[PDB]
């Protein structure tokens, strides 16, 4: 565990009446303030796989590099899935879970069928719920699900040259910056259903990645089994500083 100190909020002075110019109230009231603290931790992710001693000969070509690369890519896939929408049970809490538990999950008007698509205006409206941290565009990151991107490609507000410069969809067929926000597409969002999410905006500077040990590979020889066991492990987590900086747009009910 790692613990840091958090500086408290702000007090205020007082206006003293002219009558108290000689009494003890000429110095006003007393300001008070108490510090706080925050904690960090990690979780362990691991996978294993074995190769017997009969197959390397029993093949025209080797099968080891495939095993190693599959282990590595499984690790990466699991990490990305958990960071996206992981829970708190033995795994890092995903961005979507943080937004839901912060009451920053906005229920939009887009339907789960297609009666109402996802518009640029709906995405830009989320900046309101970020409060103070939404005032700077350079400190924000926007991630949208694939279906949301294809819906944006058909948005009626980015069609003509008169509307949006020369970056109109009809001339390009792709959407870059939106309402001043760069677009990054992700495929790991939950399924398209009622009450599910399609976009998220994150105050990038508010998120850290605690790590105890990096990716390690431990190979073991089992003579009594004539196998070679491979073990891959690491300890990571996803934690933030203060309960803010995440807002996620959801589908209607």
């Amino acid at each position: 565990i790692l613990t840091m100190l958090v500086e408290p909020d702000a007090g205020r002075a007082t206006w003293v009446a002219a009558s108290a110019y000689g009494s003890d109230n000429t110095t006003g009231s007393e300001v008070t303030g108490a510090l706080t603290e925050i904690h960090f931790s990690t979780y362990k992710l691991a996978a294993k796989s074995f190769i017997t001693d009969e197959t390397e000969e029993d093949a025209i070509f080797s099968l080891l590099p495939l095993l190693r690369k599959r282990l590595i890519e499984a690790h990466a896939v699991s990490i990305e899935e958990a960071f996206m929408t992981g829970d708190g049970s033995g795994k890092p809490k995903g961005l979507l879970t943080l937004a839901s538990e912060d009451s920053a999950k906005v229920t939009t008007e887009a339907k789960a069928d297609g009666s109402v698509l996802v518009t640029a205006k709906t995405i830009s409206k989320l900046r309101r719920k970020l409060g103070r941290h939404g005032l700077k565009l350079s400190k924000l990151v926007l991630i949208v699900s694939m279906d949301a991107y294809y819906d944006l490609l058909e948005d009626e507000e980015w069609q003509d040259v008169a509307q949006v410069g020369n970056d109109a969809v009809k001339l390009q067929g792709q959407v870059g910056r939106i309402y001043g926000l760069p677009v990054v597409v992700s495929e790991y969002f939950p399924a398209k259903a009622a009450g599910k999410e399609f976009a998220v905006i994150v105050y990038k500077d508010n998120f850290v990645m605690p790590r105890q040990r990096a990716v390690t590979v431990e190979r073991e020889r089992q003579a009594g089994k004539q196998r070679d066991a491979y073990y891959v492990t690491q300890r990571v987590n996803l934690q933030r500083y203060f309960e803010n900086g995440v807002v996620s747009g959801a589908y209607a009910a």
Partner: protein, 43 residues
């Protein structure tokens, strides 16, 4: 940890305390110092 044969006394010895103090975003001040000042030497 409570997983191996030997254990530590408590989480106080599993923890690192940092003397780093960090603060959130504070509201910017605007009206405090935008007007000219008129010094006085009497009531």
């Amino acid at each position: 940890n409570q997983s191996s044969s030997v254990e530590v006394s408590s989480e106080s010895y599993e923890t690192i305390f940092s003397q780093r103090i960090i603060r959130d975003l504070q509201k910017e001040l605007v009206v405090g110092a935008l007007f000219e000042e008129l010094p006085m030497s009497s009531k």
